Tab-separated table of C-alpha atoms and ligand atoms in Angstrom:
chain	number	residue	atom	x	y	z
A	1	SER	CA	-56.568	-28.735	-13.213
A	2	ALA	CA	-59.790	-27.566	-11.527
A	3	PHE	CA	-63.400	-28.817	-11.769
A	4	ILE	CA	-65.627	-25.802	-10.945
A	5	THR	CA	-69.378	-26.186	-10.883
A	6	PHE	CA	-71.968	-23.382	-10.907
A	7	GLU	CA	-75.303	-23.772	-9.096
A	8	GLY	CA	-78.424	-21.703	-8.560
A	9	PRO	CA	-82.082	-21.398	-9.489
A	10	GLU	CA	-83.201	-19.680	-12.679
A	11	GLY	CA	-83.000	-15.856	-12.332
A	12	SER	CA	-79.642	-16.146	-10.475
A	13	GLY	CA	-77.660	-14.639	-13.416
A	14	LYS	CA	-75.859	-17.988	-13.800
A	15	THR	CA	-75.580	-17.786	-17.657
A	16	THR	CA	-74.107	-14.262	-17.611
A	17	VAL	CA	-71.784	-15.166	-14.714
A	18	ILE	CA	-70.281	-18.336	-16.271
A	19	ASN	CA	-69.805	-16.660	-19.696
A	20	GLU	CA	-68.155	-13.498	-18.281
A	21	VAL	CA	-65.935	-15.498	-15.881
A	22	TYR	CA	-64.862	-17.711	-18.848
A	23	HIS	CA	-63.894	-14.650	-20.925
A	24	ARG	CA	-61.745	-13.396	-18.023
A	25	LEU	CA	-60.141	-16.751	-16.966
A	26	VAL	CA	-59.160	-17.688	-20.561
A	27	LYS	CA	-56.439	-14.962	-20.489
A	28	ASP	CA	-54.431	-17.025	-17.933
A	29	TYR	CA	-55.843	-20.593	-17.973
A	30	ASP	CA	-56.734	-23.366	-20.445
A	31	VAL	CA	-60.429	-23.183	-19.632
A	32	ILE	CA	-63.549	-24.768	-21.085
A	33	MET	CA	-67.258	-24.090	-20.443
A	34	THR	CA	-69.637	-27.021	-20.481
A	35	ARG	CA	-73.116	-28.184	-19.393
A	36	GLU	CA	-74.656	-31.648	-19.360
A	37	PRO	CA	-75.060	-33.489	-21.778
A	38	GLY	CA	-72.522	-31.198	-23.566
A	39	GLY	CA	-72.436	-32.823	-26.980
A	40	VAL	CA	-71.589	-36.343	-25.615
A	41	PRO	CA	-73.691	-38.600	-28.017
A	42	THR	CA	-75.164	-41.000	-25.403
A	43	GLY	CA	-75.976	-37.989	-23.157
A	44	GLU	CA	-77.604	-36.240	-26.116
A	45	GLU	CA	-79.816	-39.313	-26.727
A	46	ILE	CA	-80.743	-39.365	-23.015
A	47	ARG	CA	-81.609	-35.599	-23.160
A	48	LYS	CA	-83.971	-36.375	-26.143
A	49	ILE	CA	-85.864	-38.933	-23.984
A	50	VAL	CA	-86.171	-36.444	-21.074
A	51	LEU	CA	-87.434	-33.586	-23.316
A	52	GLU	CA	-89.819	-35.882	-25.332
A	53	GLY	CA	-91.260	-37.119	-22.010
A	54	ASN	CA	-95.020	-36.829	-21.526
A	55	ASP	CA	-95.660	-36.637	-17.747
A	56	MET	CA	-92.495	-38.773	-17.113
A	57	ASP	CA	-92.238	-40.364	-13.625
A	58	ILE	CA	-89.963	-38.125	-11.528
A	59	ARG	CA	-87.652	-40.999	-10.458
A	60	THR	CA	-87.169	-42.093	-14.098
A	61	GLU	CA	-86.322	-38.450	-14.928
A	62	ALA	CA	-83.817	-38.295	-12.003
A	63	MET	CA	-82.084	-41.503	-13.189
A	64	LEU	CA	-81.854	-40.064	-16.729
A	65	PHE	CA	-80.279	-36.784	-15.429
A	66	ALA	CA	-77.845	-39.027	-13.501
A	67	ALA	CA	-76.949	-41.156	-16.576
A	68	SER	CA	-76.424	-37.995	-18.693
A	69	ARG	CA	-74.206	-36.673	-15.831
A	70	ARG	CA	-72.019	-39.813	-15.822
A	71	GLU	CA	-71.570	-39.796	-19.621
A	72	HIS	CA	-70.643	-36.096	-19.598
A	73	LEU	CA	-68.209	-36.652	-16.673
A	74	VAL	CA	-66.449	-39.704	-18.167
A	75	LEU	CA	-66.300	-38.575	-21.848
A	76	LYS	CA	-65.854	-34.784	-21.449
A	77	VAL	CA	-64.956	-33.572	-17.935
A	78	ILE	CA	-62.357	-36.241	-16.950
A	79	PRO	CA	-60.450	-36.022	-20.321
A	80	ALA	CA	-60.289	-32.184	-19.942
A	81	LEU	CA	-59.054	-32.449	-16.306
A	82	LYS	CA	-56.310	-34.889	-17.463
A	83	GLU	CA	-55.175	-32.169	-20.006
A	84	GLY	CA	-54.858	-29.739	-17.034
A	85	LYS	CA	-57.904	-27.678	-18.015
A	86	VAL	CA	-60.038	-25.534	-15.746
A	87	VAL	CA	-63.527	-26.985	-16.329
A	88	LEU	CA	-66.402	-24.504	-15.810
A	89	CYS	CA	-69.503	-26.683	-15.466
A	90	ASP	CA	-73.033	-25.225	-15.470
A	91	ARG	CA	-75.065	-27.487	-13.086
A	92	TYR	CA	-73.902	-30.797	-11.552
A	93	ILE	CA	-74.973	-33.061	-8.605
A	94	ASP	CA	-76.409	-30.158	-6.546
A	95	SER	CA	-78.978	-29.368	-9.312
A	96	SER	CA	-80.357	-32.908	-9.049
A	97	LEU	CA	-80.454	-32.588	-5.251
A	98	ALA	CA	-82.378	-29.250	-5.319
A	99	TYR	CA	-84.682	-29.999	-8.305
A	100	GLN	CA	-85.339	-33.793	-8.106
A	101	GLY	CA	-84.567	-34.247	-4.381
A	102	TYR	CA	-86.230	-31.259	-2.825
A	103	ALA	CA	-88.509	-29.407	-5.308
A	104	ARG	CA	-89.985	-32.588	-6.965
A	105	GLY	CA	-90.204	-34.158	-3.495
A	106	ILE	CA	-88.331	-37.455	-4.108
A	107	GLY	CA	-86.125	-36.708	-1.099
A	108	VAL	CA	-82.600	-35.219	-1.008
A	109	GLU	CA	-81.020	-38.340	0.593
A	110	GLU	CA	-82.524	-40.671	-2.086
A	111	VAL	CA	-81.363	-38.423	-4.957
A	112	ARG	CA	-77.899	-38.095	-3.273
A	113	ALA	CA	-77.477	-41.930	-3.192
A	114	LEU	CA	-78.403	-42.038	-6.916
A	115	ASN	CA	-76.008	-39.228	-7.860
A	116	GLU	CA	-73.138	-40.624	-5.720
A	117	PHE	CA	-73.540	-43.869	-7.736
A	118	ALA	CA	-73.303	-41.684	-10.909
A	119	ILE	CA	-70.238	-39.564	-9.986
A	120	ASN	CA	-68.357	-42.304	-8.028
A	121	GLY	CA	-66.509	-39.812	-5.747
A	122	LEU	CA	-65.770	-37.166	-8.379
A	123	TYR	CA	-67.120	-34.159	-6.517
A	124	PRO	CA	-66.229	-30.623	-7.743
A	125	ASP	CA	-63.063	-28.905	-6.446
A	126	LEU	CA	-65.097	-25.725	-6.098
A	127	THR	CA	-68.856	-25.033	-6.377
A	128	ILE	CA	-70.109	-21.471	-6.921
A	129	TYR	CA	-73.614	-21.005	-5.502
A	130	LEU	CA	-75.331	-17.921	-6.916
A	131	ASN	CA	-77.369	-17.134	-3.852
A	132	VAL	CA	-80.388	-15.174	-5.105
A	133	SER	CA	-83.526	-14.370	-3.156
A	134	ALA	CA	-86.751	-15.820	-4.579
A	135	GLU	CA	-88.051	-12.286	-5.258
A	136	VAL	CA	-85.009	-11.025	-7.199
A	137	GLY	CA	-84.861	-14.311	-9.099
A	138	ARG	CA	-88.580	-13.966	-9.973
A	139	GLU	CA	-87.995	-10.505	-11.515
A	140	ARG	CA	-85.035	-11.791	-13.633
A	141	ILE	CA	-87.141	-14.774	-14.796
A	142	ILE	CA	-90.078	-12.504	-15.923
A	143	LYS	CA	-87.559	-10.339	-17.902
A	144	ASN	CA	-85.811	-13.367	-19.492
A	145	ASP	CA	-98.504	-18.739	-12.148
A	146	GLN	CA	-98.545	-19.754	-8.465
A	147	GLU	CA	-97.172	-23.278	-9.290
A	148	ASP	CA	-94.120	-21.822	-11.154
A	149	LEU	CA	-93.417	-19.369	-8.305
A	150	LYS	CA	-93.818	-22.123	-5.696
A	151	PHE	CA	-91.459	-24.449	-7.666
A	152	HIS	CA	-88.827	-21.611	-7.846
A	153	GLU	CA	-89.180	-21.074	-4.070
A	154	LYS	CA	-88.725	-24.846	-3.388
A	155	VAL	CA	-85.576	-25.008	-5.595
A	156	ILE	CA	-84.084	-22.168	-3.491
A	157	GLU	CA	-85.147	-23.900	-0.214
A	158	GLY	CA	-83.500	-27.084	-1.515
A	159	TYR	CA	-80.211	-25.253	-2.284
A	160	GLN	CA	-80.298	-23.562	1.181
A	161	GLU	CA	-80.578	-27.145	2.712
A	162	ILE	CA	-77.712	-28.717	0.657
A	163	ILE	CA	-75.225	-25.973	1.744
A	164	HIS	CA	-76.501	-25.972	5.427
A	165	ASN	CA	-75.262	-29.626	5.694
A	166	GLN	CA	-66.226	-26.977	2.020
A	167	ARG	CA	-66.185	-26.820	-1.823
A	168	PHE	CA	-69.206	-24.382	-1.676
A	169	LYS	CA	-68.647	-20.674	-2.093
A	170	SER	CA	-71.838	-18.589	-1.822
A	171	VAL	CA	-71.953	-15.417	-3.974
A	172	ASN	CA	-74.604	-12.734	-3.319
A	173	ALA	CA	-76.658	-12.874	-6.568
A	174	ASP	CA	-79.142	-10.158	-5.439
A	175	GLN	CA	-76.415	-7.594	-6.372
A	176	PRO	CA	-76.335	-6.107	-9.930
A	177	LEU	CA	-74.869	-8.648	-12.413
A	178	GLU	CA	-71.566	-6.657	-12.738
A	179	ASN	CA	-70.901	-7.251	-8.986
A	180	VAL	CA	-72.032	-10.905	-9.105
A	181	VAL	CA	-69.523	-11.498	-11.962
A	182	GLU	CA	-66.706	-9.666	-10.092
A	183	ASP	CA	-67.300	-11.566	-6.814
A	184	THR	CA	-67.472	-14.949	-8.665
A	185	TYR	CA	-64.269	-14.144	-10.611
A	186	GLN	CA	-62.406	-13.094	-7.400
A	187	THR	CA	-63.624	-16.220	-5.531
A	188	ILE	CA	-62.388	-18.472	-8.405
A	189	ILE	CA	-59.010	-16.645	-8.731
A	190	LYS	CA	-58.445	-16.905	-4.932
A	191	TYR	CA	-59.022	-20.677	-5.172
A	192	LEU	CA	-56.885	-21.291	-8.323
A	193	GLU	CA	-53.958	-19.239	-6.870
A	194	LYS	CA	-53.894	-21.666	-3.857
A	195	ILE	CA	-53.586	-24.737	-6.251
B	1	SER	CA	-108.684	-16.924	-31.823
B	2	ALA	CA	-105.030	-18.090	-31.816
B	3	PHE	CA	-101.792	-16.745	-33.341
B	4	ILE	CA	-99.545	-19.689	-34.304
B	5	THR	CA	-96.076	-19.285	-35.828
B	6	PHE	CA	-93.883	-21.898	-37.537
B	7	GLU	CA	-90.109	-21.728	-37.214
B	8	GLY	CA	-87.159	-23.765	-38.391
B	9	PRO	CA	-84.039	-23.664	-40.536
B	10	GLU	CA	-84.153	-24.580	-44.219
B	11	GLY	CA	-84.250	-28.375	-44.630
B	12	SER	CA	-86.674	-28.684	-41.651
B	13	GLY	CA	-89.586	-29.441	-44.034
B	14	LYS	CA	-91.296	-26.256	-42.735
B	15	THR	CA	-92.914	-25.269	-46.182
B	16	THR	CA	-94.335	-28.765	-46.721
B	17	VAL	CA	-95.481	-29.067	-43.076
B	18	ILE	CA	-97.333	-25.732	-42.813
B	19	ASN	CA	-99.054	-26.181	-46.228
B	20	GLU	CA	-100.206	-29.726	-45.360
B	21	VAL	CA	-101.247	-28.867	-41.775
B	22	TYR	CA	-103.110	-25.776	-43.134
B	23	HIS	CA	-104.974	-27.946	-45.763
B	24	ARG	CA	-106.216	-30.284	-42.980
B	25	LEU	CA	-107.106	-27.477	-40.533
B	26	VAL	CA	-109.186	-25.542	-43.174
B	27	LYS	CA	-111.843	-28.328	-43.021
B	28	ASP	CA	-112.542	-27.660	-39.319
B	29	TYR	CA	-111.382	-24.157	-38.344
B	30	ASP	CA	-111.747	-20.546	-39.426
B	31	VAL	CA	-108.017	-20.414	-40.189
B	32	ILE	CA	-105.778	-18.521	-42.567
B	33	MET	CA	-102.096	-19.080	-43.440
B	34	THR	CA	-99.755	-16.196	-44.225
B	35	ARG	CA	-96.084	-15.155	-44.244
B	36	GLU	CA	-94.349	-11.778	-44.358
B	37	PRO	CA	-94.773	-9.540	-46.313
B	38	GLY	CA	-97.878	-11.492	-47.523
B	39	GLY	CA	-99.056	-8.981	-50.127
B	40	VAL	CA	-99.160	-5.918	-47.862
B	41	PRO	CA	-97.977	-3.091	-50.236
B	42	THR	CA	-95.450	-1.402	-47.913
B	43	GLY	CA	-94.122	-4.824	-46.894
B	44	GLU	CA	-93.737	-5.846	-50.574
B	45	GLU	CA	-91.797	-2.647	-51.311
B	46	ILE	CA	-89.561	-3.296	-48.251
B	47	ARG	CA	-89.062	-6.923	-49.499
B	48	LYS	CA	-87.795	-5.492	-52.849
B	49	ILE	CA	-85.253	-3.278	-50.991
B	50	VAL	CA	-83.953	-6.340	-49.066
B	51	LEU	CA	-83.728	-8.679	-52.086
B	52	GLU	CA	-82.055	-6.033	-54.368
B	53	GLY	CA	-79.534	-5.171	-51.609
B	54	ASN	CA	-75.860	-5.082	-52.623
B	55	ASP	CA	-73.920	-6.300	-49.541
B	56	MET	CA	-76.532	-4.565	-47.378
B	57	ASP	CA	-75.498	-3.757	-43.804
B	58	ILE	CA	-76.870	-6.550	-41.546
B	59	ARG	CA	-78.489	-4.035	-39.096
B	60	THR	CA	-80.319	-2.229	-41.934
B	61	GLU	CA	-81.494	-5.675	-43.184
B	62	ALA	CA	-82.762	-6.502	-39.630
B	63	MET	CA	-84.688	-3.185	-39.418
B	64	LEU	CA	-86.317	-3.840	-42.803
B	65	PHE	CA	-87.353	-7.393	-41.727
B	66	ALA	CA	-88.841	-5.773	-38.571
B	67	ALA	CA	-90.642	-3.032	-40.607
B	68	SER	CA	-92.170	-5.702	-42.973
B	69	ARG	CA	-93.106	-7.685	-39.810
B	70	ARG	CA	-95.060	-4.733	-38.319
B	71	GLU	CA	-96.856	-3.879	-41.614
B	72	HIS	CA	-97.937	-7.517	-42.011
B	73	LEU	CA	-98.955	-7.688	-38.317
B	74	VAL	CA	-101.058	-4.478	-38.462
B	75	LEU	CA	-102.718	-5.033	-41.866
B	76	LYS	CA	-103.162	-8.841	-41.936
B	77	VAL	CA	-102.617	-10.617	-38.609
B	78	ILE	CA	-104.335	-8.335	-36.006
B	79	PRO	CA	-107.585	-7.870	-38.152
B	80	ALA	CA	-107.845	-11.673	-38.635
B	81	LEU	CA	-107.351	-12.270	-34.847
B	82	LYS	CA	-110.012	-9.585	-34.103
B	83	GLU	CA	-112.350	-11.570	-36.517
B	84	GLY	CA	-111.806	-14.650	-34.261
B	85	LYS	CA	-109.584	-16.516	-36.767
B	86	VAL	CA	-106.680	-18.896	-36.117
B	87	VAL	CA	-103.691	-17.306	-37.887
B	88	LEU	CA	-100.883	-19.610	-39.088
B	89	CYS	CA	-97.747	-17.560	-39.846
B	90	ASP	CA	-94.667	-19.003	-41.589
B	91	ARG	CA	-91.700	-17.229	-39.823
B	92	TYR	CA	-91.998	-14.380	-37.349
B	93	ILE	CA	-89.818	-12.840	-34.543
B	94	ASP	CA	-87.829	-16.027	-33.926
B	95	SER	CA	-86.561	-16.082	-37.529
B	96	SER	CA	-85.101	-12.654	-36.987
B	97	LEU	CA	-83.592	-13.763	-33.690
B	98	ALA	CA	-81.924	-16.887	-35.194
B	99	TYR	CA	-80.882	-15.381	-38.544
B	100	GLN	CA	-80.077	-11.724	-37.831
B	101	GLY	CA	-79.318	-12.168	-34.128
B	102	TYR	CA	-77.351	-15.375	-33.947
B	103	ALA	CA	-76.217	-16.544	-37.455
B	104	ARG	CA	-75.404	-13.016	-38.789
B	105	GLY	CA	-73.990	-12.150	-35.337
B	106	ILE	CA	-75.728	-8.838	-34.489
B	107	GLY	CA	-76.697	-10.347	-31.140
B	108	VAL	CA	-79.976	-12.039	-30.045
B	109	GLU	CA	-80.659	-9.425	-27.293
B	110	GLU	CA	-80.159	-6.498	-29.742
B	111	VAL	CA	-82.417	-8.091	-32.416
B	112	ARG	CA	-85.027	-8.921	-29.741
B	113	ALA	CA	-85.122	-5.182	-28.689
B	114	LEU	CA	-85.671	-4.225	-32.341
B	115	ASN	CA	-88.394	-6.807	-32.883
B	116	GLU	CA	-90.204	-6.062	-29.599
B	117	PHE	CA	-90.446	-2.444	-30.841
B	118	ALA	CA	-92.049	-3.935	-34.037
B	119	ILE	CA	-94.500	-6.417	-32.463
B	120	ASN	CA	-95.437	-4.271	-29.443
B	121	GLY	CA	-96.363	-7.228	-27.209
B	122	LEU	CA	-97.891	-9.390	-29.919
B	123	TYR	CA	-95.904	-12.551	-29.299
B	124	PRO	CA	-97.382	-15.799	-30.745
B	125	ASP	CA	-99.789	-17.878	-28.607
B	126	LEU	CA	-97.918	-20.927	-29.820
B	127	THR	CA	-94.765	-21.413	-31.865
B	128	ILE	CA	-94.121	-24.737	-33.645
B	129	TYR	CA	-90.350	-25.339	-33.943
B	130	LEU	CA	-89.454	-27.891	-36.657
B	131	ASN	CA	-86.472	-29.381	-34.787
B	132	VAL	CA	-84.181	-30.856	-37.421
B	133	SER	CA	-80.562	-31.897	-36.845
B	134	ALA	CA	-77.966	-30.024	-39.015
B	135	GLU	CA	-77.215	-33.311	-40.836
B	136	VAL	CA	-80.780	-34.228	-41.814
B	137	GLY	CA	-81.444	-30.582	-42.691
B	138	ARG	CA	-78.365	-30.506	-44.982
B	139	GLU	CA	-79.554	-33.698	-46.736
B	140	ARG	CA	-83.034	-32.230	-47.269
B	141	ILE	CA	-81.487	-28.949	-48.602
B	142	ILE	CA	-79.473	-30.994	-51.187
B	143	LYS	CA	-82.768	-32.875	-52.047
B	144	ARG	CA	-73.480	-30.532	-52.070
B	145	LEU	CA	-73.381	-27.249	-50.018
B	146	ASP	CA	-70.223	-25.063	-49.618
B	147	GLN	CA	-68.438	-24.603	-46.250
B	148	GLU	CA	-69.961	-21.096	-45.754
B	149	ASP	CA	-73.517	-22.447	-46.342
B	150	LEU	CA	-73.027	-25.418	-43.928
B	151	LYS	CA	-71.565	-23.150	-41.226
B	152	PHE	CA	-74.479	-20.645	-41.597
B	153	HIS	CA	-77.068	-23.510	-41.496
B	154	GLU	CA	-75.421	-24.876	-38.290
B	155	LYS	CA	-75.416	-21.383	-36.652
B	156	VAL	CA	-79.160	-20.908	-37.451
B	157	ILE	CA	-79.910	-24.234	-35.681
B	158	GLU	CA	-77.644	-23.264	-32.736
B	159	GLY	CA	-79.474	-19.948	-32.560
B	160	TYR	CA	-82.906	-21.576	-32.473
B	161	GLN	CA	-81.632	-24.024	-29.812
B	162	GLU	CA	-80.529	-21.042	-27.612
B	163	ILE	CA	-83.818	-19.082	-28.182
B	164	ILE	CA	-85.982	-22.115	-27.308
B	165	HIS	CA	-83.798	-22.895	-24.216
B	166	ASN	CA	-84.469	-19.396	-22.716
B	167	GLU	CA	-88.272	-19.156	-23.521
B	168	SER	CA	-89.710	-22.757	-23.553
B	169	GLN	CA	-93.418	-22.058	-22.484
B	170	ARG	CA	-94.429	-20.656	-25.947
B	171	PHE	CA	-92.591	-23.333	-27.984
B	172	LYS	CA	-93.581	-26.815	-28.965
B	173	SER	CA	-90.665	-28.634	-30.630
B	174	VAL	CA	-91.566	-31.268	-33.269
B	175	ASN	CA	-88.945	-33.875	-34.285
B	176	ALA	CA	-88.257	-32.890	-37.934
B	177	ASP	CA	-85.622	-35.690	-38.373
B	178	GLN	CA	-88.640	-38.022	-38.844
B	179	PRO	CA	-90.069	-38.688	-42.360
B	180	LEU	CA	-92.191	-35.648	-43.410
B	181	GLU	CA	-95.542	-37.606	-43.126
B	182	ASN	CA	-94.804	-38.022	-39.361
B	183	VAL	CA	-93.614	-34.407	-38.938
B	184	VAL	CA	-96.959	-33.283	-40.482
B	185	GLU	CA	-98.929	-35.634	-38.176
B	186	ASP	CA	-97.068	-34.580	-34.951
B	187	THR	CA	-97.479	-30.848	-35.894
B	188	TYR	CA	-101.223	-31.268	-36.690
B	189	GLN	CA	-101.781	-33.150	-33.357
B	190	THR	CA	-99.846	-30.513	-31.355
B	191	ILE	CA	-102.019	-27.744	-32.899
B	192	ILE	CA	-105.405	-29.586	-32.380
B	193	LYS	CA	-104.464	-30.254	-28.702
B	194	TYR	CA	-103.693	-26.538	-28.236
B	195	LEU	CA	-106.887	-25.287	-30.002
B	196	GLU	CA	-109.144	-27.668	-27.978
B	197	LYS	CA	-107.414	-26.339	-24.775
B	198	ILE	CA	-108.764	-22.748	-25.491
C	1	32E	C1	-78.709	-30.727	-14.685
C	1	32E	C2	-80.117	-30.672	-14.168
C	1	32E	C3	-81.014	-29.742	-14.548
C	1	32E	N1	-82.315	-29.672	-14.079
C	1	32E	C4	-83.230	-28.623	-14.526
C	1	32E	C5	-82.613	-27.221	-14.478
C	1	32E	C6	-83.607	-26.179	-14.973
C	1	32E	C7	-84.044	-26.586	-16.369
C	1	32E	N2	-84.709	-27.906	-16.331
C	1	32E	C8	-85.351	-28.347	-17.597
C	1	32E	C9	-86.640	-27.554	-17.871
C	1	32E	C10	-87.543	-28.135	-18.947
C	1	32E	C11	-87.929	-29.583	-18.705
C	1	32E	C12	-88.797	-27.288	-19.060
C	1	32E	C13	-84.439	-28.365	-18.820
C	1	32E	C14	-84.121	-27.233	-19.570
C	1	32E	C15	-83.301	-27.309	-20.686
C	1	32E	C16	-82.813	-28.538	-21.088
C	1	32E	C17	-81.942	-28.637	-22.276
C	1	32E	O1	-80.863	-29.207	-22.294
C	1	32E	O2	-82.516	-28.008	-23.333
C	1	32E	C18	-83.100	-29.666	-20.339
C	1	32E	O3	-82.680	-30.917	-20.733
C	1	32E	C19	-81.643	-31.563	-20.052
C	1	32E	C20	-80.673	-30.907	-19.321
C	1	32E	C21	-79.656	-31.607	-18.692
C	1	32E	C22	-79.618	-32.989	-18.800
C	1	32E	C23	-80.623	-33.628	-19.503
C	1	32E	CL1	-80.631	-35.339	-19.620
C	1	32E	C24	-81.634	-32.939	-20.144
C	1	32E	C25	-83.918	-29.578	-19.230
C	1	32E	F1	-84.197	-30.724	-18.561
C	1	32E	C26	-83.754	-28.939	-15.922
C	1	32E	C27	-82.824	-30.613	-13.206
C	1	32E	O4	-84.002	-30.636	-12.852
C	1	32E	N3	-81.910	-31.554	-12.776
C	1	32E	C28	-80.578	-31.666	-13.168
C	1	32E	O5	-79.835	-32.540	-12.720
C	2	32E	C1	-88.817	-13.645	-41.828
C	2	32E	C2	-87.315	-13.722	-41.919
C	2	32E	C3	-86.663	-14.528	-42.785
C	2	32E	N1	-85.282	-14.604	-42.884
C	2	32E	C4	-84.657	-15.510	-43.850
C	2	32E	C5	-85.224	-16.931	-43.804
C	2	32E	C6	-84.595	-17.811	-44.891
C	2	32E	C7	-84.669	-17.104	-46.232
C	2	32E	N2	-83.992	-15.797	-46.180
C	2	32E	C8	-83.842	-15.071	-47.471
C	2	32E	C9	-82.818	-15.760	-48.384
C	2	32E	C10	-82.439	-14.969	-49.631
C	2	32E	C11	-81.705	-13.689	-49.319
C	2	32E	C12	-81.622	-15.836	-50.563
C	2	32E	C13	-85.141	-14.782	-48.214
C	2	32E	C14	-85.808	-15.718	-48.988
C	2	32E	C15	-86.995	-15.432	-49.638
C	2	32E	C16	-87.549	-14.169	-49.543
C	2	32E	C17	-88.833	-13.852	-50.217
C	2	32E	O1	-89.768	-13.225	-49.720
C	2	32E	O2	-88.844	-14.403	-51.454
C	2	32E	C18	-86.916	-13.227	-48.755
C	2	32E	O3	-87.417	-11.934	-48.679
C	2	32E	C19	-88.079	-11.527	-47.536
C	2	32E	C20	-88.758	-12.401	-46.708
C	2	32E	C21	-89.449	-11.888	-45.622
C	2	32E	C22	-89.440	-10.524	-45.376
C	2	32E	C23	-88.724	-9.667	-46.196
C	2	32E	CL1	-88.638	-7.967	-45.907
C	2	32E	C24	-88.062	-10.166	-47.301
C	2	32E	C25	-85.721	-13.522	-48.124
C	2	32E	F1	-85.177	-12.538	-47.386
C	2	32E	C26	-84.706	-14.915	-45.241
C	2	32E	C27	-84.454	-13.845	-42.085
C	2	32E	O4	-83.223	-13.821	-42.175
C	2	32E	N3	-85.116	-13.049	-41.154
C	2	32E	C28	-86.488	-12.910	-40.995
C	2	32E	O5	-86.992	-12.160	-40.161
């Protein structure tokens, strides 16, 4: 079994990368693709509260992302890992650290303590960080507003901080998407072939 | 002026909602309600080709929906917007993305390329998505369905979910699982808030 998370800002090619890597890994592994809340009923109800939120307090929002994360982990991820699956998970603890911790300004250490309560030591085996520059990410976002640009920059600064302070494998996401996919696939295969 | 589209699967109460919201808005705004082809002659003739189709190729069907869309946009929508009107439109690009792109399986990116050729930058100012769960929607549709109809209905909803996830800024999702009086009220309030923001 392997619990592989994928992290990055928007415009990092993360959607293309996880989907193409899934289509390649499925030939050899029992693999699933998921994202929180991932169809888990309690998580889905929590997601409704977050998305129906009118100017929700940022700490309440962080605690709801954390509760959705625990439900998804306990009812979807852990059962799949027990079946020996390779779990490809789009966003996990590091998204809360970059978005709630850094970009929203709650503080990375405070959001870490919250998320460590939520995951109770179940950190990923491998975390792919799609390392995109703010400028390349901006162009992909436009294809797919000073405040929006500044928020995108802060998310990237937050990710740069989290990795500055073992499971992380940084992939150059400024390359064309074909190369980002190949490098991510090779990084995952190298890990899985080591058990 | 404002160009407002309404989207949703069948069973979302979309017909009832737009007609009721339109009736209330008419008292206060220079507003019109339309849908494609909406009486535009070329659009009506294209509509006949689509509805008389005998197992029509899904790509041909998409191009005809896009051709009706442009004729309606050029002849009805754009002149009304130039006259300063609020235009309420029942189904637009996102219907093609969810139905032809996702549910019929041509591909959302391919159908978006087709429809961007048709609308030539005229995306809605606001799109109201009547967000119904597959289960409530099914129950409204019955107010049983075969396995092919349920699966198609579920794919349309999945498609809309994916389209709204990748382009949130334009969309305002209204909970359509609520009784229709509340869906009407939430939609009306969302629109008033937007129009007063102009
Ligand atoms: C996992 C994680 C993500 N993110 C960000 C990532 C960028 C997208 N962003 C929002 C944007 C919208 C509010 C405009 C966003 C976008 C889409 C959705 C949806 O599922 O449709 C969504 O809902 C969710 C998602 C996950 C859990 C719950 Cl409970 C609700 C959502 F929150 C959430 C954090 O900030 N922290 C985190 O831990
Ligand atoms: C705008 C749009 C809608 N839809 C769907 C939505 C659900 C209804 N659905 C059909 C069902 C019938 C075949 C049983 C359906 C139902 C009624 C009619 C009519 O006008 O009476 C109809 O004709 C049209 C409608 C619009 C343009 C043209 Cl050209 C022909 C029609 F197609 C069409 C797409 O799929 N893509 C799109 O872009």
